Design a protein around this ligand. Structure first.
Ligand SMILES: [Zn+2]
Lengths: 181, 539, 388, 317
C-alpha cells in the first residue's frame, strides 16, 4: 500500500513542522476557513463539475467519513505537543459554554493535510478489504488534486508578525512554558 | 561600461559560489521580488568596499517600512485580553500587549554558554558564598533580636492581666512578616518551626524570652564562628583574588611558549604582507616598503636586556665556558654594531639595510618583543612608583592586622624604591632560579595592578633569545651572513649602490627554502623597519 | 552643580537570600547603605524608607495572575505548584525563596517612590539601590528578576514627565523594559551590554522598535574586556546625541557591578572609575535622574562602586581610605575603595564601535489599593545606626 | 595558610549544607507540656503521569482528554488502548464481530469505519511526520526530541568542547591571541575577508591590532566581525549564514508576499529540469547556475539580460 502527495502540500506540511517545532508558531485556530467548509466546497465543486452516474453517494459517504474521522482523530495522532495546551483552552471554554466542540468548526485544512499524510500508517495497520483500499486512496487523490487547484486561496504564505490574518499566530513565552512544561 | 560591469564583478568576487549567489540576488531583484532597499543592503556587503563601482551602480540604477528585527515576534490579539486591573488609559496607551521576548527563541533552542572563570575566580566566588551565608544569617538574627527586644521592652512596663492576652497579627507589629519566620525555621526543625512560630504568634511573653535567649546565644556562637572563619578567609583571599584578576597572565606561561616561535612570527609577518599587497592591488599599483615597525625611544632598555642576558650566561649549565664567553661577546657586539652604540656605558649589568635569514629574524623579533614589554613597564613606571610610594595604608586595619604581609616577610615589597630597578633585580634573581616563581607572579600582580602580565616569562624569552643567538655562530650560513654584514657596515655614505650586490650575494649564499628579511635601520630617531620580500627575487 | 539627592533604603531588603550558590544577591545593598552612612554623607543628604507595594500598586505592568502567584508563592508548597511555575518561569532559572513577595513589594515601592519624588520636585536625583530589577517580563521571570519595578518607575515618571529615558550600563541588559516600551514614542530605551551567546539574547542593531516606537530603542552590543577609555568613547558621544535629539525630561539609570572587571556571568573590564565617570557625565546634564541598582553578582566590588556613585551624586570626591564597618572583611587585601580592573583582552575594536555609533546616529536622526496611588508617601527613617 | 581544620567551627560547618545543631539543639520547653521516563507520545520530558498496570507514561497535555495538575483525577488513571485491552471489548464482550456491527450501527461508514474503530484502540500522541514525507527533502532531519532541523541549523556542540575547552581558548574566541582561526587547514593559506582584503592577524607584541574573522557555514567565506554588524561569533543555534546568499524569506510590500523558498528537492524523479526560454520567463527565483516545482537551468547571460531589461523597464517610474 503506497500513497503519493503532490510536492506543494508536502512543502506546506514541512513548513508547518518548521513553524511549530522550530519557529514556535501555532496555527490561527479562529480562522476564516475550516475543514467542514473545505469538504463542503470540495463536494459542491466536484458535484457541479462532472455528471451524476451514481458517484455522489460515495462522494457524500467519503466526505462524511472524513469529517467523522477528523472529529475523532484530531487529538490522537495530530496536534503537536505545543498545540495541546491551545486545544485545552478552547475545550475548557466549550465546557464553560455548555456546548460540544468538534474539530471541523475551528480547525483549518493543515490538520487535514496532516491526517492525509499519516493515513497510510493506519491503512497498513488495520485489516480491510483491498477494493475499499483502492477506493479510499483514489478519493484521496481527487481530494489532493482539488486542493492543488485551490492552493493559493487556501494556503497563502503570510507572516503573523505584521498581518492580522496569516493562518498562524506566534506563541507567547507563557504558552511555550506551559506547553513544554 | 555596462557590458564590462558584470566581468568586473566576476573578477572582484573571484569565488564561483559567491558569484552564483550574487546572480541569484540580482535575479531576485529582477523578478520583482526584491525591492531597492534589500538589493542595496546586499551590495553593501557585496561591493561595499569598491567605492567607484558602488557609486556607478547607485547612479545607474537610480537609488535615492519597518525594521522587524529577529526578536520580539508579534503576539495575536487573543493573548492581549486579560483583566489588567492596575492599568488606566495612559498605561494602556504606553504599553504594548502583543510583543513578548523569550531567550529560548534567541538561543534557537540551543541554550546559552556562560563565561568560564579561572579556578582562582571560581574559588573567589565560592568564598563569596562562604562569607555571604554566615553574615546573612547573622544579621537576620540581629533583626530578629531587635524585634524581640522591642517586644520585651513593651513587656517590661505591662502587667500580668495583659500579659496573658497579647494576641498579635502576623508581622509582630512590624513592616515585615517573613524574616522572623525564616530565622526560627532555620534555627529549629522544619516541623517544630511551625509550632514554635505559631505559639510565638498566639502566646507571647512566655515563649518570647526563651526564644530571645536562644537566638542571642546563637548570635554569639555565629559571631564567634564568623570571626574564626575571617582569618582563614583573608589569608586565602590574599593569594586568591589577585590571581583571579589575572586572566591572560595565568595562561601566559604557555601562550608565550606557543606563540613566540618561528612559524607564528613568519605567519604574522606574511599576513601583513598579503594584506598590504591585496590592499594596494585594490587601490594603487606601487607598494609601501614599511610594515610592522617598532619605535626605540629609550636607550637604557638595551643595557637592561644585556644585563638579563649576562645573568643568564652565568646561570645555565648546558653550555661550555668558551661557548658562553663567545655568546656573551657576540650578544653585546650585536647591539654595539647594529644600533650604532659605540660602547655599552652600563655599569650595573648584574639609511642602512640588513638582509638576514629566519633565525636572525626570530632573534630580532624576540628582542623587539622584550623591548616593547619593558617599554610597557617603563611608560607607566612613573605612575606606579608614586602609587606604591604613596600607598596610604588605613590605620584601622593596622590596629587588628588585616594587611597583606605575605610578600613583606621575604622582601618582595616595592615600597621605598623605584619599581623598574626592583623589577630588574627581580628578573635577575628569577633567571637565577631562586625566586619561587609564583611569588614573583603574585608580586607582579599586586605591584603594577596586574598590568605587568607580559614580564611573567622573562626568563623563558631570555632563554629563547640565547638559544636563537647560539645559532648565529654554529650555523655556517648565519655566521657567514654576520661576517658579510661586518664587511657591509662601514658608517659611510655608500647607500643606493652597494645593497643590490648585498642582496644578490645573499641570494646566491642562501637556499631556495630559506627566508630573507629586509630589516631597515635609521640612525635618526632610532627607527627600524622590517620588510617581507620572501620569494620576490628568485622568480 | 549642587543637587539634593533622595536615598531609598529598606532594612528588610537584605534579609532575603535567593538560595545557596546563587548569582543574584540582595545582601550587597545593605553594606552599600552601611558604607554610605559610614562615609558621613548623611549631613548633605535626606534619606527615607519606602513602604512596600500592595497588590494593585504592583499591577501597572504585569497581569493579575502573575502578581497573585508572586504573592502566594512559597518554597514549602512548590511540589503541587508546577503548572504555572514554568509558565511565569519561576523555579527553573529563578528559584523560589522565602520573602519573595516582600522583596518584590519593597523594590517596587522604592522604584515608584523615587519616581514620585522626582515628579513632585522636592529632590533632583533619586537613588533606590533596594531594587533595580529589569529582566522581568509581563508574565515571565528571568535573570533572577520577578518584578520589573523600573517599568513602574518609568510610568510613574510619565504621570508627570512627558518623556522618560532609560539607560542601562551593565551586562544582562533589561529586555523587560524594552519589551514594555517597544512601540511607544514618549519612552526611549538605551542600553549597553555584550552580545553573542549571552543570557538575554535580545537587542540588535536592527532592534529599534516598531510602530510609533520606531527608532526609539537604542542597543549597543559590546564584547569581552572593554576598558574605561573605549567605554567612555562609546558612552559620551551617543549620550550627548540622545540628549540633544530625544531631549528627555527624566533619566532612569540602572547602576550595577555586573559590568565590572570582576563578575560571575559578566564579561566586561570596567573599573570603578570607568563605571562611575559615565554616571558623572550623565549627571552633569542637570536634568532629573532616577538611579536604581539591580546588577552585580560580585559583592565586595559592588558595595564599593555603589558607594562611589552615591559619593559623586553627593557632588563630593571620596577618599581612597576605607573606614571600618560591620562588613569590613569582604574587601580586598589592599582594603581601599578601589575596584581594580583586570588585564583581560580588549577585543572591542574601535572600528566596530564606530560603525555601531554611525548606524545608531542614522537611526536616531529620525527622533529629532489605588487609594495610595501616585506614591509620595514614605516613612522618615532618619534614625539609622549603620555607622561603625 | 588556610586552616579548615580548627577554624571551621562546630556550630556551622561547610556552607551550602546543614548540621545536627538544628536537630539536637532544638528542644523547646516553653509550651510547659512498571513506569517509563520518556513519554512515548511526544518523546519529550516534563511532568509525568503513569498507569499502574501499563509501562507507558504520558504527559498531562498529551492525552485525548486534556487535564491539568491542579485538578488531576483521583484513584487509578488508565490508558485509552488500556480501556480497550484491560477493560471492555477485550475482557468481557470478546472481540468476535464488534467491528462489523459497528459499521452495521454507524450507518455504512465502512470506508472510514475501521479507522474510527481503531481510533479508540490507539494511544493519543503528538503529530509525527511520516517517513516518506521526510525522505522527500534531504536537507531536513529529525532532532533529538523530534523537532524540525534543516541545513540552516547548526549541529549542537559536544559537551567536551562546550565546557572543558581549557581556559585560554574560549568558544567565541573573545580572549587571548588565536592565530589558528585565521589559517584554514585545507590549504594553509590566510583567510581574506570579503569586505576588506586583509587577514589582519596582527602581531603577538600588539594583540590589540588583531581582528577576529569567521568562516561561513555554507561557502566557507571569511568575514571580519567589524565589517558585518555583529558583536560575537555564532556557535549555538542556527548556522551562521553570511549576508551574501539568498534569504529564505523576503518582504515586498504591495498586502505582501513571503516566498519562503522551496528548501530543495532530492535527486529522484521529483526534481524536474526544463530550460526553454531565457528572456521574460517569470520563474520567481528558485534557479541554479550552470556553465509541480519547476526550476530552470539559468545562466549568467539570462540573469544579466533580464535584470537589464527590468531596470530599463522601470526607469520611467
Ligand atoms: Zn545581568
Amino acid at each position: 500500500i503506497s500513497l503519493q502527495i503532490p510536492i506543494k502540500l508536502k512543502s506546506v506540511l514541512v513548513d508547518d513542522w518548521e513553524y511549530v517545532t522550530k519557529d514556535k508558531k501555532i496555527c490561527r485556530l479562529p480562522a476564516d476557513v475550516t475543514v467542514e467548509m473545505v469538504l463542503n466546497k470540495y463536494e459542491h465543486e466536484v458535484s457541479q463539475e462532472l455528471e451524476s452516474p451514481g458517484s455522489q453517494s460515495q462522494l457524500s459517504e467519503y466526505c462524511a467519513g472524513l469529517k467523522l474521522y477528523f472529529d475523532k482523530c484530531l487529538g490522537n495522532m495530530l496536534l503537536y505537543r505545543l498545540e495541546r495546551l491551545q486545544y485545552d483552552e478552547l475545550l475548557k471554554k466549550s465546557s464553560k459554554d455548555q456546548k460540544p466542540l468538534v474539530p471541523i468548526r475551528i480547525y483549518g485544512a493543515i490538520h487535514l493535510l496532516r491526517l492525509i499524510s499519516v493515513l497510510p500508517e493506519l491503512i497498513s495497520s488495520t485489516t480491510m478489504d483491498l477494493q475499499s483500499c483502492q477506493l479510499l486512496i483514489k478519493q484521496t487523490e481527487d481530494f489532493l488534486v482539488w486542493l492543488l487547484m485551490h492552493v493559493d486561496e487556501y494556503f497563502n504564505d503570510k507572516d503573523p508578525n505584521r498581518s492580522d490574518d496569516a493562518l498562524y499566530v506566534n506563541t507567547s513565552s507563557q504558552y511555550e512554558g506551559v506547553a513544554l512544561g | 561600461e555596462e557590458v564590462t560591469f558584470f566581468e568586473k564583478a566576476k573578477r572582484y568576487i573571484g569565488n564561483k559560489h559567491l558569484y552564483t549567489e550574487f546572480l541569484k540576488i540580482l535575479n531576485l531583484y529582477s523578478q520583482d521580488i526584491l525591492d531597492l532597499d534589500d538589493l542595496v543592503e546586499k551590495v553593501d556587503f557585496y561591493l561595499g568596499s569598491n567605492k567607484e563601482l558602488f557609486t556607478w551602480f547607485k547612479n545607474f540604477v537610480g537609488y535615492q517600512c519597518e525594521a522587524f528585527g529577529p526578536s520580539y515576534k508579534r503576539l495575536p490579539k487573543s493573548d492581549t485580553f486579560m483583566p489588567c486591573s492596575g492599568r488606566d488609559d495612559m498605561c494602556w496607551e504606553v504599553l504594548n500587549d502583543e510583543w513578548v521576548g523569550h531567550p529560548v527563541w534567541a538561543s534557537e533552542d540551543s541554550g546559552f554558554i556562560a563565561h568560564r572563570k579561572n579556578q582562582y575566580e571560581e574559588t573567589l566566588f565560592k568564598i563569596e558564598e562562604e562569607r555571604h551565608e554566615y553574615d546573612f544569617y547573622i544579621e537576620s538574627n540581629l533583626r530578629t533580636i531587635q524585634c524581640l527586644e522591642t517586644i520585651v521592652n513593651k513587656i517590661e512596663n505591662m502587667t500580668e492581666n495583659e500579659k496573658a492576652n497579647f494576641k498579635l497579627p502576623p508581622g509582630l507589629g512590624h513592616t515585615s512578616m517573613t524574616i522572623y519566620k525564616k530565622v526560627i525555621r532555620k534555627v529549629y526543625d522544619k516541623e517544630r518551626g511551625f509550632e514554635i512560630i505559631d505559639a510565638l504568634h498566639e502566646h507571647p511573653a512566655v515563649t518570647a524570652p526563651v526564644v530571645l535567649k536562644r537566638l542571642k546565644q546563637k548570635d554569639e556562637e555565629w559571631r564567634r564562628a564568623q570571626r574564626e572563619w575571617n582569618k582563614v578567609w583573608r589569608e586565602l583571599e590574599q593569594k586568591v583574588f589577585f590571581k583571579s584578576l589575572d586572566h591572560l597572565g595565568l595562561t601566559f606561561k604557555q601562550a608565550d611558549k606557543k606563540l613566540l616561535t618561528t612559524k607564528q612570527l613568519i605567519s604574522e609577518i606574511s599576513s601583513i604582507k598579503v594584506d598590504q599587497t591585496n590592499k594596494k592591488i585594490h587601490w594603487l599599483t606601487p607598494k609601501p616598503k614599511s610594515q610592522l615597525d617598532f619605535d626605540f625611544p629609550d636607550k637604557n632598555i638595551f643595557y637592561d636586556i644585556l644585563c638579563l642576558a649576562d645573568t643568564f650566561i652565568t646561570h645555565t649549565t648546558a653550555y661550555s665556558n668558551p661557548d658562553k664567553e663567545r655568546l656573551k661577546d657576540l650578544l653585546k657586539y650585536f647591539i654595539s654594531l647594529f644600533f650604532s652604540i659605540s660602547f655599552e656605558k652600563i655599569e650595573e649589568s648584574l639609511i642602512f639595510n640588513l638582509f638576514a635569514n629566519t633565525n636572525i629574524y626570530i632573534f630580532f623579533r624576540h628582542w623587539t618583543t622584550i623591548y616593547e614589554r619593558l617599554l610597557e613597564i617603563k611608560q607607566m613606571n612613573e605612575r606606579v612608583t608614586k602609587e606604591i610610594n604613596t600607598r596610604s595604608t588605613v590605620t584601622f586595619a593596622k590596629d587588628l592586622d588585616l594587611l597583606s604581609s605575605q610578600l613583606s616577610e621575604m622582601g618582595l615589597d616595592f615600597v621605598g624604591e623605584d619599581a623598574y630597578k626592583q623589577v630588574l633585580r627581580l628578573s635577575r634573581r628569577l633567571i637565577n632560579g631562586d625566586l619561587e616563581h609564583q611569588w614573583f607572579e603574585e608580586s607582579l600582580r599586586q605591584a603594577y595592578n596586574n598590568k605587568a602580565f607580559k614580564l611573567y616569562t622573562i626568563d623563558k624569552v631570555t632563554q629563547s633569545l640565547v638559544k636563537h643567538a647560539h645559532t648565529l655562530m654554529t650555523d655556517a650560513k648565519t655566521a657567514e651572513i654576520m661576517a658579510l654584514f661586518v664587511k657591509d657596515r662601514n658608517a659611510s655614505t655608500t647607500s643606493a649602490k652597494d645593497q643590490i650586490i648585498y642582496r644578490l650575494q645573499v641570494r646566491s649564499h642562501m637556499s631556495n627554502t630559506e627566508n630573507m628579511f629586509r630589516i631597515e635601520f635609521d640612525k635618526r630617531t632610532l627607527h627600524v623597519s622590517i620588510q617581507y620580500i620572501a620569494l620576490d627575487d628568485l622568480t | 552643580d549642587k543637587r539634593r539627592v533622595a536615598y531609598f533604603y529598606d532594612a528588610d531588603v537584605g534579609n532575603y537570600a535567593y538560595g545557596a550558590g546563587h548569582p543574584m544577591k540582595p545582601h550587597r545593598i545593605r553594606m552599600a547603605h552601611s558604607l554610605i552612612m559610614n562615609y558621613g554623607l548623611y549631613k548633605k543628604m535626606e534619606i527615607y524608607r519606602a513602604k512596600p507595594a500592595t497588590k494593585q500598586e504592583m499591577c501597572q505592568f504585569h497581569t493579575d495572575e502573575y502578581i497573585d502567584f508572586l504573592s502566594r508563592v512559597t518554597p514549602d508548597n512548590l511540589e503541587m505548584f508546577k503548572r504555572e511555575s514554568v509558565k511565569f518561569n519561576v523555579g527553573d532559572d529563578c528559584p523560589v525563596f522565602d520573602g519573595l513577595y516582600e522583596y518584590c513589594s519593597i523594590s517596587g515601592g522604592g522604584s515608584m517612590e523615587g519616581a514620585a519624588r522626582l515628579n513632585r520636585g522636592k529632590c533632583d536625583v533619586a537613588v533606590n539601590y533596594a531594587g533595580g530589577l529589569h529582566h522581568a517580563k509581563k508574565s515571565e521571570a528571568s535573570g533572577f528578576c520577578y518584578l520589573n519595578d523600573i517599568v513602574l518607575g518609568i510610568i510613574e515618571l510619565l504621570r508627570y514627565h512627558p518623556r522618560v529615558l532609560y539607560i542601562d550600563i551593565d551586562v544582562h541588559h533589561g529586555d523587560g523594559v524594552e519589551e514594555a516600551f517597544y512601540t511607544t514614542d514618549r519612552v526611549m530605551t538605551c542600553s549597553f551590554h555584550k552580545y553573542g551567546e549571552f543570557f538575554p539574547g535580545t537587542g540588535e542593531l536592527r532592534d529599534i522598535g516598531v510602530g510609533a516606537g520606531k527608532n526609539y530603542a537604542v542597543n549597543v552590543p559590546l564584547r569581552d574586556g572593554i576598558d574605561d577609555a573605549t567605554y567612555r568613547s562609546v558612552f559620551e558621544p551617543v549620550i550627548k546625541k540622545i540628549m540633544e535629539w530625544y531631549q528627555p525630561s527624566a533619566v532612569v539609570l540602572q547602576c550595577g557591578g555586573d559590568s565590572l572587571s570582576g563578575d560571575r556571568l559578566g564579561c566586561f573590564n570596567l573599573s570603578m572609575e570607568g563605571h562611575a565617570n559615565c554616571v558623572n557625565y550623565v549627571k552633569s546634564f542637570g536634568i532629573p535622574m532616577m538611579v536604581v541598582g539591580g546588577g552585580g553578582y560580585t559583592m565586595r566590588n559592588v558595595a564599593r562602586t555603589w558607594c562611589f556613585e552615591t559619593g559623586l551624586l553627593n557632588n563630593v570626591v571620596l577618599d581612597k581610605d576605607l573606614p571600618y564597618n560591620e562588613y569590613y572583611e569582604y574587601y580586598g587585601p589592599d582594603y581601599k575603595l578601589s575596584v581594580r580592573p583586570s588585564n583581560m583582552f580588549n577585543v572591542n575594536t574601535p572600528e566596530y564601535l564606530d560603525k555601531v555609533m554611525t548606524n545608531i546616529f542614522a537611526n536616531l536622526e529620525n527622533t529629532k489599593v489605588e487609594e495610595d496611588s501616585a506614591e509620595a508617601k514614605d516613612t522618615k527613617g532618619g534614625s539609622q545606626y549603620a555607622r561603625d | 595558610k588556610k586552616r579548615p581544620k580548627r577554624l571551621s567551627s562546630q556550630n556551622v560547618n561547610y556552607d551550602l549544607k546543614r548540621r545536627k545543631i538544628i536537630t539536637s539543639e532544638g528542644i523547646e520547653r516553653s509550651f510547659k507540656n512498571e513506569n517509563e521516563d520518556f513519554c512515548s507520545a511526544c518523546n519529550q520530558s516534563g511532568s509525568f503521569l503513569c498507569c499502574d498496570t501499563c509501562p507507558k507514561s504520558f504527559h498531562f497535555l498529551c492525552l485525548d482528554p486534556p487535564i491539568d495538575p491542579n485538578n488531576l483525577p483521583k484513584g487509578d488513571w488508565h490508558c485509552n488502548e488500556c480501556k480497550f485491552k484491560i477493560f471492555i471489548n477485550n475482557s468481557m464482550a470478546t472481540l468476535k464481530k464488534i467491528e462489523s456491527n459497528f459499521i452495521k450501527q454507524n450507518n455504512n461508514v465502512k470506508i472510514f469505519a475501521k479507522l474510527l474503530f481503531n481510533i479508540d484502540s490507539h494511544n493519543p500522541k503528538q503529530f509525527q511526520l511520516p517517513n516518506y514525507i521526510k525522505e522527500t527533502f534531504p536537507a531536513v532531519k529529525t532532532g533529538s526530541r523530534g523537532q524540525y532541523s534543516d541545513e540552516n541549523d547548526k549541529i549542537p556542540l559536544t559537551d567536551r568542547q562546550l565546557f572543558n575547552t581549557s581556559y585560554g581558548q574560549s568558544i567565541t574566541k573573545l580572549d587571548s591571541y588565536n592565530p589558528d582561526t585565521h589559517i584554514d587547514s585545507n590549504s594553509g593559506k590566510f583567510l581574506i575577508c570579503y569586505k576588506c582584503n586583509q587577514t589582519r592577524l596582527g602581531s603577538w607584541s600588539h594583540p590589540e591590532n588583531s581582528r577576529l574573522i569567521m568562516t561561513c557555514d555554507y561557502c566557507q567565506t571569511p568575514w571580519h566581525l567589524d565589517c558585518v554588524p555583529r558583536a560575537s561569533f555564532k556557535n549555538l543555534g542556527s548556522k551562521w549564514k553570511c549576508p551574501l546568499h539568498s534569504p529564505t524569506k523576503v518582504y515586498k510590500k504591495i498586502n505582501y508576499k513571503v516566498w519562503k523558498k522551496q528548501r530543495l528537492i532530492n535527486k529522484k524523479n521529483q526534481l524536474y529540469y526544463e530550460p526553454l526560454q531565457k528572456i521574460g520567463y517569470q520563474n520567481n527565483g528558485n534557479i541554479q547556475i550552470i556553465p509541480d516545482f519547476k526550476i530552470t537551468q539559468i545562466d549568467e547571460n539570462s540573469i544579466k539580460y533580464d535584470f537589464f531589461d527590468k531596470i530599463y523597464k522601470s526607469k520611467m517610474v
